[PDB]
Ligand binder design. Sequence first.
Ligand code: HEC
Ligand code: HEC
Ligand code: HEC
Ligand code: HEC
Ligand code: HEC
Ligand code: HEC
Ligand code: HEC
Ligand code: HEC
Ligand code: HEC
Ligand code: HEC
Ligand code: HEC
Ligand code: HEC
Lengths: 407, 407
Amino acid sequence: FHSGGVAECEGCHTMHNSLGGAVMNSATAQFTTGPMLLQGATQSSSCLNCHQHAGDTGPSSYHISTAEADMPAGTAPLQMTPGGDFGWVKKTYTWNVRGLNTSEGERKGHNIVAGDYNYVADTTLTTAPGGTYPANQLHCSSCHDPHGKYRRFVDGSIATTGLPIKNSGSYQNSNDPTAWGAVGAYRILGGTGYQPKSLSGSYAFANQVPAAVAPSTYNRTEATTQTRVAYGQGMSEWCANCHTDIHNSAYPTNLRHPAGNGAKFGATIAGLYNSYKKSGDLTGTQASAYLSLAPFEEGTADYTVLKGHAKIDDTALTGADATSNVNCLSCHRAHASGFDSMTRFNLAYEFTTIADASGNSIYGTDPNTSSLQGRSVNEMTAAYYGRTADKFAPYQRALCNKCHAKD
Amino acid sequence: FHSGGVAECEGCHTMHNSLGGAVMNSATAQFTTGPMLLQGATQSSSCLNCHQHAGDTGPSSYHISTAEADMPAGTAPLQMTPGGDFGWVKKTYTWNVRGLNTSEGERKGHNIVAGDYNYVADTTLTTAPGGTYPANQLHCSSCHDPHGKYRRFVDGSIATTGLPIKNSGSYQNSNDPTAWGAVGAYRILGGTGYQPKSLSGSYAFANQVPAAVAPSTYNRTEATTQTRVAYGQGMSEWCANCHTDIHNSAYPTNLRHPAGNGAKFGATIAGLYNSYKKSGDLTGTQASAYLSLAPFEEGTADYTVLKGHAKIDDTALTGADATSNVNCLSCHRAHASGFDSMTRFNLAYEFTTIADASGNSIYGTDPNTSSLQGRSVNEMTAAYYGRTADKFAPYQRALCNKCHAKD
Ligand code: HEC
Ligand code: HEC
Ligand code: HEC
Ligand code: HEC
Ligand code: HEC
Ligand code: HEC
Ligand code: HEC
Ligand code: HEC
Ligand code: HEC
Ligand code: HEC
Ligand code: HEC
Ligand code: HEC
């Protein structure tokens, strides 16, 4: 559809809301289209009309959210992207240990605005924490560039114009940009000047598009092999481009957890990342010890090495480096994850698992517990992207001790 | 929260000092956390933000200090732990018998550093008496391990890694360490190599974690039954691990009061411990004669016997043994006690009580006396953990004649 840049130009837009007499999208009546001539009531329904295919038997191809008619109150959202399902924003859990605990769905993700799909905007976070960016204006075109104008050339520069776009910058089986044609940006997100016309403020992006290489055929379970995304240089600065006061390139002279190009691993931290396998099983290696729940920047922009370190198979499970950096997106899965702060981690209880009597592991036996937190064992399994009770310690503590071994 | 080891990982730390837009701890402004990313101005406010619940009607659950808004100048701190309240460090008493006497609150406890709770560091004791350990650096993580790394295995060995942690080593209704999972240390204190990263000296712990079994539901008055803590082997050596020159395993070849594994009771001393009930009432027995104000090591590490001799009820009031040792923590309650040298004893006046005219006992009638020492009778009662004028002799001398009968 997109193929690096702008797409089939009626795929998202519509001109008269009519094609063969029929309404092109029933959210608005015929002979009136909607906002910015799009197919939908908002700027995100024109994304969610072929993304979010209603009716799924697993994470299929490129979809990023699951229809509400597919999920009851007993199952998890059924698409496993590196961004995660937006269906997690409509999950409010109530478990009754020593009182009650409400883990509402507002805190689990970016509440995009989509009236026809009941994606209500975030009510508690009225603006972005860090900047002045509104949450009643956040759409899918608010951080992605829907036209995909941003290119990359043979010298790695990124420009809004010049040589035309031939394919996507992600997907390691892509092509290199030539002297006659450019390759589009990684996951066509805007940068260094991007602002939608629908915004009436000084909300211009001032950070470049993040260099990374995602793997093709990425919607998968991670019970067998892990999804390695290259995450090269500018992911933390791009997340800082709208959450201004959050990133931290200098630790400590800000007293925030470091995230940026200057947020290097120590030689101590990189050894603790490579050693950690389970709780107390500090026997890991440089190679064959990687966790997608805590990635790192590997802070170069050499796309040959980035396509080398981007593989669906386990042939590229190299661990940390002393010169490796810290992502924003190390914790905080990008779209939504279902863990009350959009993080990849269960941080509301002290150990993420339960050992059943003869000591193998489970996630629990009952939603009304403190360890499992008002959900099924299948929903906690799918929240860890199909990672079952094994690959973890039986009483494994919170997974953000990966690169400190504070166990 | 902790459950033997490291906890809900945002329970003490914070990453951006923001959650739902609001500041996670108002001692530091938003988008800057504090020292070591903790919730508070110091490393102890991140302990005292859910410990020390402001507003109490007695010793409730697990709290260790009382808020200053709960105590006037007429009442005592209201939590009775085996460590004692840190509120006792802010009690300066002035009684005017033949001049005046100032019993300042610096001498009554470990002055931890907490700027938001006005716990000022100790000014007279600049370092630890016995070592070179500073008092301007003492925090709750300075003698406890805040991550609780130290484990114990099925063979009683203690290691920093190996099998993971499932529960606390204290609390006699705990579980035994299995071949698949370890039990955390007694009262998660560090040992044999513990040193915080915030210290820039050679202050490494070289003594093991003390073997003991504390009783569950311990915050209580002791007007009815006593709180028996097992206190097994290494409490005196662990207190020696930072107060180096103080402990004494060989008496006399040091001329200090003995405290250690080699500081055994004599056959004379163990008989004097069992005989002492009150002043002059030397009629006690082996069984049914125990005082929590003067415990002993019972110097084994057999945790079955230690959980046997750890009971809130009076079913385990066995007295001394000829092979029993002497704690540090026999005198000197651990956190703070309010007796000008952190001891469990009133050692500033010759008899701890007053007989009122027809000879029953009181603690006094007036703070401006020598027997009651500038405090209420209720504050002296709560300083003895709710022990009233009875259970004592009417003119009972200083309680450290328990195991000598030097009355
Ligand atoms: C100028 C006054 C007119 C009139 C009378 C019509 N158009 Fe358009 N049109 C455009 C595109 C891309 C489509 C197909 C997809 C869509 O509707 O968005 C159409 C469709 C129609 C139809 C119906 C055809 C059908 O199959 O039902 C009719 C009757 C029609 N148009 C009439 C594109 C454009 C424009 C592109 C910017 C312009 C201008 C117009 N049309 C203008 C007109
Ligand atoms: C409106 C509902 C949409 C749709 C249809 C998509 N997005 Fe996003 N997206 C964002 C970021 C930072 C990434 C990259 C994360 C990573 O690579 O680890 C993505 C990725 C995607 C994909 C590719 C699948 C993937 O996980 O890589 C797709 C198909 C996709 N998006 C579609 C950022 C955002 C937002 C930032 C606040 C917003 C809103 C959206 N995306 C919205 C949408
Ligand atoms: C990389 C540059 C970023 C950005 C833009 C954000 N984070 Fe974090 N975050 C983490 C945790 C554990 C929480 C919840 C508790 C806490 O704040 O300590 C958060 C919270 C946020 C928010 C606000 C959410 C809210 O409910 O108010 C925002 C806007 C945010 N983050 C942005 C954890 C981490 C990390 C773990 C080590 C990493 C790295 C980052 N976040 C990085 C970023
Ligand atoms: C910062 C204000 C804290 C907090 C919240 C706690 N401590 Fe301590 N502690 C120390 C020792 C040697 C013990 C065991 C004493 C015994 O078992 O007899 C304890 C015990 C505790 C407990 C359990 C309650 C109890 O009395 O057993 C709790 C909840 C607790 N602590 C919390 C030693 C120290 C210190 C040594 C100088 C420092 C400082 C602190 N603790 C600080 C704190
Ligand atoms: C880089 C991909 C980013 C990460 C990681 C996060 N963001 Fe955002 N963000 C924006 C707004 C207006 C909000 C409030 C709306 C809402 O919360 O639904 C947020 C919120 C978050 C949150 C908190 C989610 C919660 O409700 O608890 C997290 C953890 C988060 N964001 C992480 C705006 C923007 C934005 C503007 C165009 C960008 C590029 C990003 N955010 C990027 C990231
Ligand atoms: C085993 C639990 C211990 C007992 C019993 C005592 N200590 Fe300490 N200690 C340390 C410092 C730096 C000081 C000076 C700071 C201050 O006094 O507030 C102290 C002080 C004491 C005192 C005197 C209190 C007074 O002001 O009169 C007593 C009676 C005492 N300590 C008993 C340091 C440390 C430490 C370093 C990490 C450890 C493990 C201990 N102390 C342990 C014990
Ligand atoms: C609303 C304006 C959006 C946004 C923000 C995105 N899409 Fe789609 N999309 C479609 C298909 C078939 C694919 C895979 C094939 C391909 O990428 O060429 C995608 C992929 C994406 C991506 C990933 C691109 C990358 O470089 O990896 C992104 C970021 C994305 N989309 C965003 C199909 C449709 C479609 C109807 C056929 C509609 C409408 C949209 N997409 C709308 C949007
Ligand atoms: C600051 C880093 C600290 C330190 C040094 C300690 N805590 Fe806590 N604590 C909390 C709760 C609910 C309990 C009882 C339940 C349980 O122990 O699992 C405790 C208990 C302790 C202990 C005793 C442990 C033992 O093995 O007996 C100790 C030594 C201790 N704490 C030290 C709750 C909190 C909490 C917020 C919910 C905060 C923050 C802390 N604790 C912080 C600290
Ligand atoms: C889906 C991937 C789209 C395709 C294909 C095209 N457009 Fe688009 N457009 C899309 C969105 C989600 C928005 C809203 C942005 C906002 O400001 O809210 C737009 C907007 C426009 C605009 C408005 C001005 C601007 O955004 O700067 C114009 C003029 C526009 N689009 C033109 C346009 C053309 C010419 C396209 C085909 C070659 C085209 N769009 C395709 C989503 C999508
Ligand atoms: C409260 C009980 C805490 C929890 C839960 C976690 N941490 Fe912690 N941490 C805590 C304190 C009081 C301190 C200060 C120690 C000092 O040196 O002053 C720390 C410190 C750290 C550090 C610094 C390095 C070090 O102390 O050796 C790190 C890297 C750290 N903490 C990591 C960490 C992780 C990964 C945690 C959750 C799994 C975690 N901490 C929880 C108190 C508490
Ligand atoms: C992919 C790496 C990564 C993960 C995930 C991560 N951290 Fe860290 N953390 C680091 C690095 C690197 C440092 C900097 C160490 C240094 O400066 O020596 C650091 C520093 C810290 C510090 C300050 C320590 C110091 O020495 O000053 C704290 C506290 C901390 N992290 C907490 C956390 C918490 C809590 C989590 C779980 C939410 C977490 N981290 C997850 C990599 C990580
Ligand atoms: C729980 C036991 C315990 C308590 C409390 C205790 N002592 Fe002792 N004390 C002993 C033991 C055991 C010895 C060693 C006796 C021996 O070596 O024969 C001893 C020895 C002594 C000695 C040396 C006696 C000798 O024979 O050499 C003195 C003096 C002394 N203690 C004073 C005190 C004082 C003063 C207090 C009150 C602060 C006190 N003790 C509290 C147990 C205790």
